[PDB]
Design a protein around this ligand. Sequence first.
Ligand code: GTP
Ligand code: GTP
Ligand code: GDP
Ligand code: MG
Ligand code: MG
Lengths: 90, 442, 442, 430, 332
Amino acid sequence: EKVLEDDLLAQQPVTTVLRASLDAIRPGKNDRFTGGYSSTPYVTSDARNPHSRFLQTTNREDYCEKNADLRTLRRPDLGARSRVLLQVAL
Amino acid sequence: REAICIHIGQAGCQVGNACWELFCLEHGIQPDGAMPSDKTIGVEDDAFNTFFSETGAGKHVPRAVFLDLEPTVVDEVRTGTYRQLFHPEQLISGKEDAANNYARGHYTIGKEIVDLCLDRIRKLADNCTGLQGFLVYHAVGGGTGSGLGALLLERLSVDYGKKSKLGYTVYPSPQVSTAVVEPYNSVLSTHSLLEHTDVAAMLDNEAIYDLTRRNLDIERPTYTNLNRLIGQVVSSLTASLRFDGALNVDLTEFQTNLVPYPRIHFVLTSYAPVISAEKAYHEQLSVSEISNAVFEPASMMTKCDPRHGKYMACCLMYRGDVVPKDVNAAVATIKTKRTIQFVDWSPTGFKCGINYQPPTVVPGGDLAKVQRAVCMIANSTAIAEVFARIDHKFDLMYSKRAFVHWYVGEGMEEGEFSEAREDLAALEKDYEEVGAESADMD
Amino acid sequence: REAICIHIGQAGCQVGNACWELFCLEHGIQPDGAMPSDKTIGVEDDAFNTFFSETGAGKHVPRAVFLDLEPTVVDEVRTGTYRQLFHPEQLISGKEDAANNYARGHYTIGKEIVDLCLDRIRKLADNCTGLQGFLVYHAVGGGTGSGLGALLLERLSVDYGKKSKLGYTVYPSPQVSTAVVEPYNSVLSTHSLLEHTDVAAMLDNEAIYDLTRRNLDIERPTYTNLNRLIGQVVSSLTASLRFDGALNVDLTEFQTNLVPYPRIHFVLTSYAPVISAEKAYHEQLSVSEISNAVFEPASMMTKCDPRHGKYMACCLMYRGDVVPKDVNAAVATIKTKRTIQFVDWSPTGFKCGINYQPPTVVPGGDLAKVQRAVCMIANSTAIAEVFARIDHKFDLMYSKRAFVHWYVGEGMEEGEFSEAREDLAALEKDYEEVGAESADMD
Amino acid sequence: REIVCVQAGQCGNQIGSKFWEVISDEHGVDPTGTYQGDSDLQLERINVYFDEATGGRYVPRSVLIDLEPGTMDSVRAGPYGQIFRPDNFIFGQSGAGNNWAKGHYTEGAELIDSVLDVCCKEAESCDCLQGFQICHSLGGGTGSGMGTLLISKLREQYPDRIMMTFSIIPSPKVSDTVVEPYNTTLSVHQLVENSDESMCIDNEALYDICFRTLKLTTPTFGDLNHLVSAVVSGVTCCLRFPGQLNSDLRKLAVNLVPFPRLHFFMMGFAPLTSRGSQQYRGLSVPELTQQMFDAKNMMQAADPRHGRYLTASALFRGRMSTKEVDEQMLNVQNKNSSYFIEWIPNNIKSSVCDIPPKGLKMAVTFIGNNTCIQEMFRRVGEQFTLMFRRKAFLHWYTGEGMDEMEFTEAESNMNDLVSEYQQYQDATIE
Amino acid sequence: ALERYAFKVDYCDPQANLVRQYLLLYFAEDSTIEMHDLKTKRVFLKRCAYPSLTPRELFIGATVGVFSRSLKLVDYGDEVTRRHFSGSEAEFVVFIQEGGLCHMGSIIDRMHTWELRITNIRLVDLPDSLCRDLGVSRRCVAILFKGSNAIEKVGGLSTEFPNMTVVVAEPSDVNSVRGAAFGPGGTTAVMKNCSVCVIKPHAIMSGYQGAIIQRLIDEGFHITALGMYSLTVADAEDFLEVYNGVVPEYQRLVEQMSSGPCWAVQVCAENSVSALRAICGPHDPDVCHVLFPHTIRSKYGVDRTRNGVHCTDLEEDAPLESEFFFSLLQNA
Ligand SMILES: Nc1nc2c(ncn2[C@@H]2O[C@H](COP(=O)(O)OP(=O)(O)OP(=O)(O)O)[C@@H](O)[C@H]2O)c(=O)[nH]1
Ligand SMILES: Nc1nc2c(ncn2[C@@H]2O[C@H](COP(=O)(O)OP(=O)(O)OP(=O)(O)O)[C@@H](O)[C@H]2O)c(=O)[nH]1
Ligand SMILES: Nc1nc2c(ncn2[C@@H]2O[C@H](COP(=O)(O)OP(=O)(O)O)[C@@H](O)[C@H]2O)c(=O)[nH]1
Ligand SMILES: [Mg+2]
Ligand SMILES: [Mg+2]
C-alpha cells in the first residue's frame, strides 16, 4: 500500500479518463456516488516504462536497406595517378 | 541456363526472402531491379539469366512464385523492402489456411487455388528457352505445404512430363517439435513425394541450431540465420550453372550420379567453412581441411549419423580458389579412412565439381569471408532412421485414431492412412534390402 | 564467483548493514541499487558478481537474505535508507522472538519459518552458475540465533551437500555479559555447529572494545564501530575473489590449508592497520611493521592469549600495494621469533595472498586512509581456553537446574544438556591431543 | 477475417466494456471512435474487429443483449460507451428472475428474432467471416438461457464457422444465487452439443491471482474483468499482427481437441507480478514458462497435479528466439513426463507474434486441455442432485413450461461428460 | 581536470581489410590505459603503464599508436568526456595577410602553444567580393581551427603581431569562406623549377610544423603553395612508387602516410631540389645526430620510417609530385 500510494503521488499534479481510483466509491455529482473502477492501473503492465508499444517486426529489422547495400562489396578504388594513367593507356 | 523456383507456405516464403536477398547481392541487382554498372564499355555478363530476366528498359524481375493460403506473410512481402522487385502476379495468396490438415489443403481448399498457380507457371515457361528443371521449397510439417505441394507437383508432373523436380524440404525434427499432428501430415506428404520427385534434400532445424551453436558463437538463433544458411547452400549448388569453372555439373548430371534406383532419391547435405570472422584469420583453410570437415556429422543439416549406414554416392561441389590436384589428394585420403564405408556395388563413389567464383559475403551475415568452400550432397542408407521414427510416432498416435475425425470430415477416405503407411513401410524395407551385402552367390 | 549471505537475528542483521554498506561503497553502487547516470561506459565489469546480480534495466540487487523472528530490526531495514536495495521477499520476519530459549527457536517457532528460508535460498541458488559457498552471520548467545541458525544449517547441509559453509560467530565474552542464560544457549549452539560448519571464526566483544580503546582513541565505543571492523574483515577475505592480484586464494584453498583434521576447524582472526588519522601522520606503515603487528595479542579480536598454545596453520591476506619479496622477508622474520611457536608436524606453516585493491574509506568511519593492509586467520590450540570457561559457567548453573524448567516446558529433554556438555568435553580433549609431541625417541 | 462478438447479461456486458476498452487502446482508437495511431501495423488489421464509418470513424462489431436496460444505461454511461452502435443494443422490459426457463422460453422467444436479424446484418457484411466469440455467465438467468438459445440458432445458420465461448461458472465456496446448479446444468447440456471450444473461469481463481500474485489490498470487479479482457484480446493476437509462426483459432482447435466432445479448456496469462516486486526481476522465457505452469496463475479451481495434460497451446507475443521456446517446451515435457498423456508424442504447440501488448516486453496466453476440469462438473452435479431429490424450487421452472424430462437429460449428459473425462484420464495403451 | 577519459576508436586491419571498433579508457591519476571490445564485450588489454601517451593528445579526430596499432579517435564513449568537451567544437577562421607571410611559422607555433587544433589550412587567393566584405588582402593564408576558449585566446595575436591577422567568428562568414577558400578549384603552385616537402602525420600530431615552416622561411626559400590532404592507402602507394625495392621500410612508410592527414609545402629557389635535400638531411636520423646535427631530421626524427619530413630526391619528378599534390588531390 505504501509503495502504491507513493507511486500515485509521484506523478505530475494538475477530456480525461480515470485509470484507477484508490477510493472504492467516488463522491460523484450531487449525492450520487459511483464506483467499480480498477484499484491499480498496473495490472498486465510495467511501471518502469508504461505507455510504450514496440511496433516493429522481425523482417523489417532483418532485411532492412542497410543489408542490401552494394557499396561494401566493391573493391577499393585506385589512386589518382593510376586513374589518370589508366585513362591514358586505354 | 534458366531454372524456376516454387515457394510454398510459411517456411518456403521465409526461405525465399533469404534466397532472393542472396541472389540479388551476388549478381549486384539493387532492390528496385536495376544494375548500377560502373562503365558503359564492355557488356554485362549473362550469369543473371539463370534467375532473372530483363525488360526492354533493363529492369530485372525474378523467375519465382510464392504460394500461400494465408495472406499475412505474402502481404508482409508485398509491404516489405523488396516490394518493387517481384511482379505482383507472382505473389499469390488465399484467404484462409489449411489449419495443419493435409486433407483440407489437398481436397477442399487447394483445388480452388491450383489453376491460378498453373497459369502463372505456364506464363513463366513460355518466356524461357532452356528450362532445365523446377526447384521447390516447402515444409512437410504443415497443412498447406504438404497438401498443395503434393497436388501441384502432381499437376506439373502430368503437364510437363520428363522435366526434373528437385526439392528442398523441411521435415519434422527428431525431438524438437512444433505441432501435434506433424506425423500424419509428414506421412501423407511423403507418400505423394515418393512417386513425383527426382531428388529430395532433407533438412532439420535442430541440426542447423546445433551447427550455429557449435561453430558460430550464437546463443539465441532465429529463423533468419537458418534461412541464410539454406540460401548459401542453394547458391553453392546452383553456382555450377552460372559461372566459369574447370568441371561443371548440370542438374541432369546430378540426378544421373546420385540416384541408383528410382525410389532411392533422398540425400544428405553438409557445408564446410562455417566459421566466424574472428576465428578465420588465425587459421589457414586449405582444401584438405574443408574436405575433412564435410564428412564429420557435426557439419550436417539433418540429424542423422552416417556411421550407422553406408554411402551410395557423393557429389562434391568446390567453389573458389581450388586446384584439381588438391581435390584428388583429398578424395584419396578420404578413401583411405576406415570409418568411411561404401556399399561394395559402388566402387567409384564420387562426383566432383569445381567453380571459380568464391562465396559472397552478406552485410548482416554471421559467416566470415573466405576464398573457398565445399558443399556435399550424398545418398546414404542412414536416412531410413528418420522414417522409422516418424512411422513409430504415427503407429502410437494411429492406434487410437487420434484426431482422425478432422481428416475424415475434410474429405479424405480413412483408407488413405493405411495405404501411405504401407508404402512407407515398403520404402524402409527397400533401404534394408539395398544395403545388404551380396554374400549370396548363385 | 558467487557467494550467498545469510543473516540471522539481531547481531547478524546489524553486522549485515555495515557489510552491505561497505560492499556498495567499494563497488560504487548507490543506495538505491543503481549506478551514476554519467559514469556508464557501454561495457560493464564482473567484479560485482560475487555479491550482486543485475536486472535487465541495470539495477543492482544483492545476494542476501535477512532472517529474524522479531519484526523490529527488519522493519528498520525496510524503513531505513537502504529500502530500495533489498528485494522485499528477501526480508523475512516472524511475529515474536525466541525469548533467549534455544528450544523456542528450534522446536516451536523456527519450524514454521524455516521452509520460507529454504525456498528463498533455492530461488537464489537456481539463478547462479558458480556458487562456491555460504557465509553466515549470527550470535550464539540469543535464542533465535542459536536455535534457528542450527536448524537452518542442518537443513542447508542436507539439501546442498558438499558446498562450503563459513560462519562468523559472536561468542559470549569471558567476563562482560548481557544475559543470564548465555552459557546454555552457547553450549547447545556449539553442539550443532561442530558437525555442520567448515570454518568457524571467533569473536569477542570485549576484545573489539579493547582494540578500539587502545589503538583508536574512542572512550565510549558502540556497536556500529565493532560492526564496521567485522565488515572490513569480511571484505578483506572476499577481496581475493573480486579483484586482480599476484597470488589469488579460492575459498576452497582456505579450507584445504587451514584445516588439518575434520574437527579442528575453529580459527582466530586479526586486522593490522587499525589506526586514527592523527596517529597516521606520525608513522610510516611498511609491510614489516604491520606483519609484526598482526602477531601481537593487542591486535586480536578474540579474548585469548596465543602464547599459551601452538600455532598449527596461518593464512595471511595482503591487500594493496605489496610486493611478494616483502611478504617473504616478513614471514621469515616472524619465523625467527622465539615467542612464536609452531607444532613440529607443520613445517610449512603459512599460506599467502596478495591483491592490488587497497582498503576502502567509509564517510563516517574512524580508520585512517592507508595504502596497504594485512588480515590473518590462524588455527591455534589456545582456543581450548575459551570453551573451558563457558563449560565452567554451565557446570555452575546446571548443578542446581537453575533455569531448566523453561527449556523442558518449551519442549526439550533434560538429557540434551548432558549430551552437549559431553561433546564439548570431547572437543576440549581433541585440542589437548592434537597439540602433543610423540615418537621423540628414534 | 472478421470476428463477431456477443455480450449477454450483466457479467457479459461489463466484461465486454472492458474488452473493447483494451482493444481500442491497443489499436489507438480514441473514445470518440477516431483512429489516432502512429504505425501502419496498427491500421492494417483494424477490419478484424472494427467496421469503418464515414470520415475516419470505427464502430465495434458487437451485439449487446439484456432483459432490463439498467446495465445498458450503465455501459452507455461509461467512458468508452459512445463507440457502440445504438441499433446494436437489444433489450426487453422485464428481468430474467434468475430463472433459466423464463430466459429460454418466454422472453427468449419474444426477443430472439430481433437478435438473429442483427447478427445476420452483422455477419453478411464481412467479406469472409471467421467464428463467433461469446462471453456470458452460466449461473445467471438471461445470460444462460438466451445465450444458449442464440448459440443453438447460430449453429443452425452457420454450421461451417467456429463457435468459441468464455464462460463464468459458480464458485465452490460462496454462492451468489441459490438456484445456480439448475442453470449451470442446463447450460452445460446445451454447450456440449452446440459449442466447438469452451473456456471456463472461476471468480475464486481470479481472487487468488490478485491476492497471491498482485498482492492487491482491495480488489474490485474491474481488476478481474481486466485480466479476462487481457487474455481474451491475447488469444486472437496472431490473427491480427505479423509473426514468425502464425496461428489461428481453427488451427488451435485442430491441435487441441483429440475427440470432438473434449473441447473444454483451461486458461492462463503469464506476466503477473506486483508493482513493488516488478523492479527486481526482468522478463525472460524461463520466467514466463515457470509462471505459465504454476497453478497460482491458472483461472480454474481444479489443480493440474490431480490430472494429466492431453494437449496445450502457447501463443507468444514479442521479439524472441525460437531456440529458447522449443528447448523450454522440451525441458518442461521431459521433467514432468508423468503428467502428459503418453500416446501423443508432443502435447504443446507454440506460436510467435511480433507485437506484444502495450507496456509488456513479452507476453504469452496459455490454453490447456486437462482432465482435472472433471472436478468442477462433479461438484455442480452434486448440488443439483441434492436439490432435485427434494423438488426444492422446481415449481418455478415447471410453471414456466419445462418438462421434467429436460432435467433428467441434462443430468445424464453431464454425468456422461464427467465419466468420459475420467475414462480418458485412466486410459492405457495395452 | 579528468579522472578517466573514454573514447571509441577504429583500427584499419591490413590483413583482414575490415574496420574494427574498440573502447579506449585513459586513467590520468597514474597514466595507465585499458582497451575493451564493443562487438564481443570482452577485455582487450589490462591496465598497463604507457608513458608515451599524454592527456594533451586526446581529442576527437586524433591518431595514436598503441602496441604497433594505429588507432583513430572517432566519438566520445562517455558523457563525462562529452560534457568536458561541450565547447571546443565550433570552427573559426584566422587569416594572414600579405605582411604576415614572413611570420606565418611563428603564428602557427603560437596557435599550437594555445591548445588549438587546426582542422584545415590552405594558401589561396580570394575573390574580390569576400576580399571587400571580410577586409583581407588578395593573397592570404586561411587557417581553420577549433579548441577550448578559442576567441579569448586568439585575441593575443593583435598585440603580438600588429596588423597582419584577421579573426572571423560569425558562422555565416565561416560558411562562405569554407565554400570559397577550400574545396575543389584552382591552385597557386608552379609547374617548373620547384620542390615539394611533406610533413608526416606524426610530426603533425607532435606539432613541430610551425618550426619547420619558419626554418624554411629563415633559410631563404619561398613558399608558393601549401595545403593539407588526407591520403588513402592506394594514394600513399602511388606517392611512393619509386621507393619500392630501394629502401627497406616501404610498407611502414605506406602505413605511416595513410595513418592521418599530412601537410605539403612547395619551395622555389635556386637549384631547389638539391638545396632542399641539403637542408633536410640524410634519410637516417642516426647519421644526422652524429655528422649533421643542424638538420631538420635530427631535431624532428627518430628512425627511418618517422624521420619527420619528406623531400624530393630525383629532379625528374618535382613537377610530378607537385601535380599529384596540388591538382589531382585538390581538384577531385
Ligand atoms: N527452417 C525454417 N523452418 C520453418 C520456417 N518457418 C516455419 N518453419 C517450420 O516448418 C514447420 C511449420 O510449417 P508451416 O510452413 O508453418 O506450415 P504451413 O505451410 O504454413 O501450413 P498451414 O499451417 O496449414 O498454413 C515447423 O516445423 C516450423 O518450425 C522457416 O522460416 N525456416
Ligand atoms: N558485535 C555485536 N554484538 C551484538 C550486536 N547485537 C547483539 N550483540 C550481542 O549478541 C548477544 C545477544 O544476542 P542477540 O542477537 O540479541 O540474540 P537474538 O538473535 O536476538 O535472539 P532472541 O533474543 O531470541 O531474539 C549479546 O552478547 C550481545 O552483546 C551487535 O550489533 N554487534
Ligand atoms: N467475473 C465477473 N463476474 C461477474 C461480473 N458481474 C457479475 N458477475 C457474476 O455473475 C453472476 C450473476 O450473474 P448475472 O450476470 O447477474 O446474470 P443475469 O441476471 O442473467 O445477467 C454472479 O456470480 C456474479 O458474481 C463481472 O464483472 N465479472
Ligand atoms: Mg500456415
Ligand atoms: Mg532478537
